[PDB]
């Protein structure tokens, strides 16, 4: 009766008022994608052509929205619905696709397909903390599954053993702005729970960093150029090679790692690979005296 | 239910020699030598031939029309 309708987990207060099903949302499996940024989410083409962003026709996006209307719902990038300034919503079919496009003017609203750079919410359940949902950028790929960057996985507590994730598309401009400014991914790298890094490298990132930066790790010119191109670094010219082996130049992995760090960065600490404290103590003492130790002196007892 | 035409790894054709391999196996010979004499040297093709089990004969009996 009414009391059971109001109370309980399935009641109106919890199942219909505090939390309720929403429109313009998708949900599917996630797969890894290191090739995209932490700000980007892999949106399938089928999902993108279904979820629509309502964009008002202005003086600067009139041509783009006209092209979206002229493409239609079956062509990407296209549109699904058109709302006139008075407020009648018309679904775009093949017959009226050109007629509505010719009738487009300033003040009209076009529910266009999801495009690159669009801001959407990416949430995984259960949402134990405020970092369980972040606003990503839409990246459209022709496959079926969602794609999320690996460093963003620890915030979501999500692996790729059949994990299901939801995506929410804000409709109003205020909601899109709020998602872009507040709940953007890069704005939530540090976890407020403990004041430490949450969006961070894991597993293969740590292993590759150790393999690159370990002692005796050297790479050829072709390998260095290939990794520089793969990482998307703006290194126009190769640095001076550290040593020559068999007549060919070799670059230390520390030299390649140094290009990532800013030029005015200086920090020293001890990692988990410490099992000879004598060398660490000597390095700390050498840093303590001069406060600007010579790079040759550091490399002698590195 | 039926033997694949090509090996899943390299695309080497194995359906031609599967029935000869099955007949020689039922005769009591060592399947390794049977695979060796049939040209099945890579263990991926050997995987495809050995792990396959014929089941189409049990599906043909159930008519569908």
């Amino acid at each position: 009766t009414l009391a059971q309708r109001l109370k309980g987990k399935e009641g109106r207060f919890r199942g219909n008022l505090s939390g309720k099903r929403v429109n313009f949302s998708a949900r599917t499996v996630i797969s890894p994608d290191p090739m995209i940024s932490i700000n980007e989410v892999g949106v399938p083409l089928a999902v993108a052509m279904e979820l629509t962003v309502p964009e008002k026709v202005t003086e600067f996006n009139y041509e783009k929205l006209k092209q979206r209307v002229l493409n239609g719902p079956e062509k990407y990038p296209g549109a699904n619905y058109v709302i006139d300034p008075e407020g009648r919503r018309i679904r775009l079919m093949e017959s009226n696709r050109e007629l509505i496009a010719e009738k487009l003017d300033i003040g009209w609203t076009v529910e266009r397909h999801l495009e690159d750079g669009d801001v959407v919410l990416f949430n995984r359940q259960p949402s134990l903390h405020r970092m369980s949902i972040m606003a990503h950028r839409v990246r459209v790929m022709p496959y079926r599954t969602f794609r999320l960057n690996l460093p963003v996985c620890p915030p979501y507590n999500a692996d790729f053993d059949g994990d299901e994730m939801n995506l929410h598309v804000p409709q109003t401009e205020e909601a899109q702005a709020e998602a872009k400014i507040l709940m953007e991914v890069q704005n939530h790298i540090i976890s407020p729970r403990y004041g430490g890094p949450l969006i961070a490298g894991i597993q293969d990132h740590i292993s590759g960093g150790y393999l690159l930066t370990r002692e005796g790790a050297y790479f050829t010119r072709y390998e260095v150029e290939q990794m520089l191109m793969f990482a998307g670094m703006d290194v126009n010219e190769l640095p001076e090679p550290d040593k020559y082996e068999n007549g060919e130049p070799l670059w230390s992995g520390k030299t390649i790692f140094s290009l990532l760090l800013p030029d005015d960065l200086t920090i020293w600490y001890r990692n988990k690979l410490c099992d000879e404290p004598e060398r660490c103590e000597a390095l700390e003492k050498l840093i303590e005296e001069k406060l600007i130790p010579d790079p040759e002196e550091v490399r002698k007892l590195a | 239910m039926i033997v694949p035409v090509r090996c899943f790894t390299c695309g080497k054709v194995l359906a031609d020699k599967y029935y000869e391999f099955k007949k020689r196996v039922e005769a009591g010979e060592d399947p390794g030598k049977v695979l060796d004499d049939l040209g099945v040297e890579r263990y991926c093709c050997r995987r495809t031939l050995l792990s396959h089990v014929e089941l189409i004969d049990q599906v043909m009996v159930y008519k569908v029309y």
């Binding site: - | 695309g11 004969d57 043909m60 008519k63």
Partner: protein
């Protein structure tokens, strides 16, 4: 560039390439794997199908059937393939087994290479009739268009010092595995034309007792065909494809 042929069989060739670097060998292997075009069943029109296998399964099995490619008529080295369609019509009635040799090809030179490939078993009252349309395609789009398999390994020489215990066991194992072995007064050299792995007892000598050197610019290539093309013509077709790609890149650079 020196070419030395090790083994030739009507379906495979193992040889040694010298004078080329690692990128060229990798490019040749990838061109053979994915760029060399062959004839494979691309579309299937079904008239009757009462077998246990579905239409998709039968179509996929037909696509896996190797078809002979007439490389003389069709310029397989062209970057754009000819839009020629070959129709293979089958109309069989059960009971029995449908083989690849029962297909009636519309072109004499475009026929299944292996006529003993089973397709489906037909029971009493079951009949299968279809027309399979085949066209030229590359292995980079689907695995049905691959001319076969290709791989290569580094031509490495393994030097085993006579001071290493039980070196005669390694020598006789290499001789049994068909590897060229040379014997000197101080060490034995084994040419690894195939995959050679040292046993566990010789693992402790891999640093100072037994050494492995890589011959600069020499590789051992093994290319096997399924009958679509002659195994000698696949390498030539791949090299001509690489030449055409280089010419097209030069033309694009000139246009730019």
């Amino acid at each position: 560039v020196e070419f030395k042929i090790l083994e030739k069989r009507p379906d495979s060739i193992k040889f040694i390439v010298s004078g080329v670097d690692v990128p060229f060998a990798n490019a040749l292997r990838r061109t053979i794997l994915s760029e060399v075009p062959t004839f494979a069943v691309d579309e299937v029109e079904f008239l009757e199908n009462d077998s246990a296998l579905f239409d998709e399964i039968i179509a996929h099995r037909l696509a896996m059937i190797p078809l002979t490619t007439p490389h003389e008529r069709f310029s397989l080295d062209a970057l754009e393939l000819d839009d020629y369609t070959v129709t293979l019509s089958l109309e069989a009635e059960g009971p029995g087994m449908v083989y690849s040799g029962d297909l009636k090809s519309s072109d004499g030179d475009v026929k299944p290479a292996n006529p003993n490939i089973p397709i489906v078993k037909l029971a009493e009252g079951q009949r299968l009739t279809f027309n399979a349309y085949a066209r030229l395609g590359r292995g980079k789009d689907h695995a049905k268009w691959q001319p076969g398999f290709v791989y290569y390994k580094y031509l490495t020489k393994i030097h085993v010092s006579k001071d290493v215990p039980d070196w005669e066991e390694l020598k006789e194992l290499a001789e049994r595995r068909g590897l060229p072995v040379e014997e000197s007064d101080e060490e034995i050299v084994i040419t690894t034309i195939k995959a050679f792995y040292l046993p566990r007892k010789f693992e402790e000598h891999m640093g100072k007792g037994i050494r492995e050197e890589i011959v600069p610019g020499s590789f051992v290539f093994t290319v096997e065909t399924n009958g679509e093309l002659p195994v000698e013509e696949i390498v030539s077709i791949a090299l001509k494809i690489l030449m055409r790609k280089s010419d097209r890149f030069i033309n694009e650079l000139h246009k730019l």
